[PDB]
Design a protein around this ligand. Structure first.
Ligand SMILES: CCOC(=O)[C@@H](F)[C@H](O)c1ccc(Br)cn1
Ligand SMILES: CCOC(=O)[C@@H](F)[C@H](O)c1ccc(Br)cn1
Ligand SMILES: CCOC(=O)[C@@H](F)[C@H](O)c1ccc(Br)cn1
Lengths: 412, 412
């Protein structure tokens, strides 16, 4: 048997806002968080825009001294984590601190720090590398710093599964609770890859939209004029909690996490199979995990990256899993507004999936002016769609063919 | 109910050898793999030696076409994974490919590739970044590329928990199998952090031994003259398999994985607590998970990094967990010979713990000339100790205060 897992707190930094309610308001209004990247000479780059976090104030969370030791992706992860723990109302005590752990991940981790220390190393040699370079840049330091700050002694780890990180982090944290290794977990991911090496790295692979003239129209999942994903920064964190533990302290429960699927495509390093066979196995695994018939799904938060191949693979995957129900659910890509937060994508999209359940509304796929060949599902083009949502799926597909699916349900 | 997990295949690159048996021969003979680094000019650096893999031929495993795209840490991880799979005798089929996954992790990932692409960006501009920079550097692409080459469609992920990565990767993969999420997992880790950024970064923290004039004597866990860890490269991979699945196919079983513990110190970003309280919590979690009396433990493969604070914290933890039995078990640090493979340390040390069970011998702690104050356990100083070993424990403790413990026992 297995314990039940609920969501009792959420926290976020995104291109749409510095917390969950500001981000969610932007999502339901179809606002874009995408703009030209400031304070950076991107003249020589084929992409000059992305989803930046605007006006982040790290001194709301950390002292100047502790902030200087930490890459922006760690700052962002800690901001989301502190928000989520505050939102949960949980009180850490000597009686429960061994039962509270952390799994906050990242796809690409501390590129900004690596860039700045490369500069020191190439220009002045190794003796000008910062002493906090390593501990301030390693992906497991959101989990590490959070556990030190709050006194959490539970399972402490970090996933790095590229664009799937945030989905896997949440799913595995939910397993830890379900199988009794923890009663509470803070889970999610963070990313700040808008450095030269990030825009340059994805640019070299020609994976990014180059729609420099109209950045807000660049991210257009399933639209015939899409030309690659939009690179975005931020973080998402959820407080996952065993149901009886949540009920005993009178926690506000947002939703239940009922299903988690994983699969490998075993197909290509960066491209999904055209038929989305891997994504289809992963969704089927997640529904089996939840004991749910495909017909019970109302809402899918797609991976929906705005790549030619990825977007069409997900349509094929959903038609395959859902058959005669594939048109009755609503599926949307909030990446149309946020861009692609890479390892934080799954974290912020799990939060959007929980809020779709709370507010009974499917967020829009903006910029979906001209659906592509066979993109004839209900993709919630342009504007939010109030509807019945009992069950919401959130999908992530990443480099290496690594897939994850979360299944959330309304809690009563 | 929870299924039993056994080890049916192992694979390794280390400073001592290009496979498991050559590395193990070195371990039992007390040989050092530590030597001045040849692959770059380190005259500006305070540490100029480490544990290199010597004479690695990637063309034993991969086409030159594919090898050229991958960071050394990925090449090392694939080599160890291929060795492990071949050693297992397992055949991948349409009937079992959905039930075989991979969890190969890294602490730092493709730092050589990142540094080289940073150099291109700064000297020549973004148009000179490799198109393969991201998929060839990102930590999850051991798991990704292995799944693509062998057709593994089961759970596909990667951990990054700094110096605990290999132990956590093996533990969590064992839980996948235990809980029914897979029947087989390839799990471990790989590392190649020996570039200017890595030696410079750890140097800037003053975490490394600076014994440049006697590199084979540098790694001296629990010795009064120790002065930090020795940086080393390589990979370990194990094929973990559900017991009845192994029995059904007539697999050779090396040993059974009976216990896994995790804990967070919640103390400091880099330093362990002097009393080893988190390490003690982690070992107790693992022994209770294994259903053991602590007196059943015969051998501990320590973390034993050759840091002043780390080594003595481990003695304090072991004395706290095992009481008077702490004087009866044998505990050694193979890092005395291999140095510290960071995210691959737990993976190679899990293999050495399994071979300790197969061959009924405690590997030595070489260089243990003058044991420090209170380091008065059986630390297997200088020479391998043949002895009865039914139960072997492998510990790892990392930045962020993140702890892991694996418990292995003989299988009859
Ligand atoms: C291209 C992907 O790169 C990364 O993920 C890096 F962030 C990597 O994990 C790393 C390098 C150096 C140090 Br210090 C810590 N972590
Ligand atoms: C302080 C944590 O205490 C516990 O009892 C367990 F959580 C245990 O450490 C553990 C955690 C996660 C996984 Br996977 C496996 N084992
Ligand atoms: C008996 C052989 O060893 C000695 O005589 C001493 F040198 C002692 O072993 C020592 C101390 C510090 C370091 Br570094 C290395 N060796």
């Amino acid at each position: 048997s297995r314990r039940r897992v609920v969501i009792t707190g959420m926290g976020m930094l995104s291109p749409l806002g510095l917390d969950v309610p500001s981000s969610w308001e932007g999502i339901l209004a179809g606002r874009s968080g995408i703009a030209p990247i400031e304070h950076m000479d991107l003249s020589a780059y084929s992409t000059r825009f992305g989803g930046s976090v605007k006006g982040f104030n790290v001194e709301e969370y950390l002292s100047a001294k502790e902030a200087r030791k930490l890459d922006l992706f760690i700052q962002y992860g800690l901001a989301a984590s502190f928000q989520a723990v505050r939102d949960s109302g949980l009180e850490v005590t000597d009686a429960n601190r061994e039962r509270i752990g952390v799994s906050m991940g990242s796809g690409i981790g501390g590129l900004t720090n690596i860039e700045n220390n490369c500069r020191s190393l190439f220009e002045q040699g190794p003796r000008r590398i910062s002493p906090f370079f390593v501990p301030g840049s390693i992906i497991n330091m959101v989990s590490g710093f959070l556990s030190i700050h709050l006194g959490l002694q539970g399972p402490n780890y970090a996933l790095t599964t590229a664009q799937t990180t945030g989905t896997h982090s949440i799913g595995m944290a939910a397993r830890n609770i379900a199988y009794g290794e923890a009663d509470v977990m803070v889970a999610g991911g963070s990313e700040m890859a808008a450095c030269g090496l990030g825009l340059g790295g994805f640019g070299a692979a020609r994976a990014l939209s180059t729609r420099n003239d109209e950045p807000t129209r660049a991210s257009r999942p399933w639209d015939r004029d899409r030309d690659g994903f939009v690179l975005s920064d931020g973080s998402g964190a959820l407080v996952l909690e065993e149901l009886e533990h949540a009920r005993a302290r009178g926690a506000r429960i947002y939703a239940e996490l009922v299903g988690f699927g994983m699969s490998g495509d075993a197909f290509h390093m960066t491209a999904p199979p055209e038929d989305g066979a891997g994504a289809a196995r992963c969704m089927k695994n997640a529904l089996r995990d939840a004991g749910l018939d495909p017909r019970q799904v109302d809402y899918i938060n797609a991976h929906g990256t705005s790549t030619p191949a990825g977007d069409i693979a997900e349509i094929a995957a959903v038609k395959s899993v859902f058959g005669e129900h594939a048109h009755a659910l609503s599926m949307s890509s909030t990446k149309s507004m946020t861009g692609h937060l890479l390892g934080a994508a799954g974290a912020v999209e799990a939060i959007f999936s929980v809020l779709a359940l709370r507010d009974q509304v499917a967020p829009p796929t903006i910029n979906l002016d001209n659906p592509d060949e066979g993109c004839d599902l209900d993709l919630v083009a342009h504007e939010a769609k109030p509807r019945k949502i009992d069950v919401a799926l959130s999908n992530s597909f990443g480099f290496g063919g690594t897939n994850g699916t979360l299944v959330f349900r309304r809690f009563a």
